[PDB]
Amino acid sequence: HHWGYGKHNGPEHWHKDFPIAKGERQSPVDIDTHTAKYDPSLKPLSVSYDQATSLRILNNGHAFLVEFDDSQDKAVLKGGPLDGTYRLIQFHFHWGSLDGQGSEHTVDKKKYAAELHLVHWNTKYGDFGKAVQQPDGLAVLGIFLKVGSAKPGLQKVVDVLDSIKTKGKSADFTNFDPRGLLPESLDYWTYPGSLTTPPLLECVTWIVLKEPISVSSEQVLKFRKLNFNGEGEPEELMVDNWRPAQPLKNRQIKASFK
């Protein structure tokens, strides 16, 4: 008995166990494209994933994660609004039960079918556990997914989901190149936020890309076949594992771009 996305343990209930849920820098938020401010000071993002080493894929009962070896600066994120080097540790998605919902961040109230999160931690802090306790500990790259043409680079992930259908299941997932999940343009918004799942720490510097990638209906459909439950329990489809937009409060969203 803990947190989830159901009617009795969903986002609206999280504050009881995680008071920070009502904090000053919570995520996600709605990106109001007309109030975001263009900042000429923002540098272009620098994504260096050529030496990435994926290790395993697992279904943690809330989403599925693809874990990477973060023992060295193999896959890092630099530049943009960041000061230092951030190592990629894992990526996961949030998606809906229908193509009209699923993303966590919204753009002018527009919801996308899903949202990809590539989580990186600031190397100055030694390890992920220490980084989450700092205001500039994490830097999460958010990418929107819209339904249209298939994304070749995503098929490898889609094909292994059958092996990790239920909570607790994990499978070897080596030699996966995350570069196949990036859009053509790296233009971004950025704002200070938090992790959108418990424990909801406000240690994130969010970097949400303007350009969505397209995925086919067939690809997203396979996401919807996963289970929140563990093997041997009543089947509950893993859909709508997204948190609604939170109050922006005293924060400003900056844009790299036009």
34 annotated ligand binder: no
160 neighbors 225 (Cβ within 8 angstroms) = no
Residue 105 bears catalytic tag: no
Q: Which stretch binds Zn ion (CB under 5 A): 4-12, 116-124, 171-179, 238-246?
A: 116-124
Q: How many whole angstroms separate alpha carbon 250 and alpha carbon 241?
A: 27
Contact between 66 and 90 (Cβ < 8 Å): yes
**Interatomic CA distance for residues 181 and 221, integer angstroms:** 18
Residues 6+ away with beta carbon under 8 Å from 170: 56, 57, 58, 59, 164
Q: Which stretch binds Zn ion (CB under 5 A): 2-10, 32-40, 114-122, 180-188?
A: 114-122
Residue count, binding to Zn ion (CB under 5 A): 1
Q: Which is nearer to Zn ion, 117 or 210 (by Cβ)? A: 117
Tell me the closest approach of the beta carbon of residue 251 to Zn ion, in angstroms: 19
**What are the residue ranges of helices labelled H in the chain?**
128-131, 155-160, 217-223
Nearest to 191 by CA among 57, 80, 63: 80
Footprint of Zn ion on 204-243 (CB under 5 A): none
Report, in Å, the least distance between residue 92 CB and Zn ion: 6
Q: How many CB atoms lie within 10 A of CB 207?
A: 25
To the nearest whole angstrom, how small is the minimum distance from the Cβ of residue 211 to Zn ion? 19
In the structure encoding, which two tokens stand for residue 134, read together? 């700092």
Closest to Zn ion by CB, 105 or 117: 117
Tell me if 117 contacts Zn ion by CB under 5 A.
Answer: yes
Smallest distance, Zn ion to C-beta of residue 40, A = 30
Q: How many CB atoms lie within 10 A of CB 62?
A: 18
> Closest CB to Zn ion among 85 and 194?
194
Q: Is 106 annotated as a binding residue?
A: no
Q: Which residue is nearest to Zn ion (CB)?
A: 117
Of the candidates 2, 15, 62, 105, the residue annotated as catalytic is 62
d(CA 147, CA 155): 14
Q: How far is the CB of 138 from Zn ion (least distance, A)?
A: 11
Q: Is 117 annotated as a binding residue?
A: yes
Is 121 within 8 Å of 70 (Cβ atoms)? yes
Q: Which is nearer to Zn ion, 60 or 155 (CB)?
A: 60
- Applying the rule CB under 5 A, the residues between 36 and 65 that interact with Zn ion are none
Amino acid at 83: D
Residues flagged as binding site for substrate: 196-197
Residues that are catalytic? 62
User: Using CB under 5 A as the criterion, which residues of the chain lie in contact with Zn ion when the complex forms?
Assistant: 117
Residues flagged as binding site: 92, 94, 117, 196-197
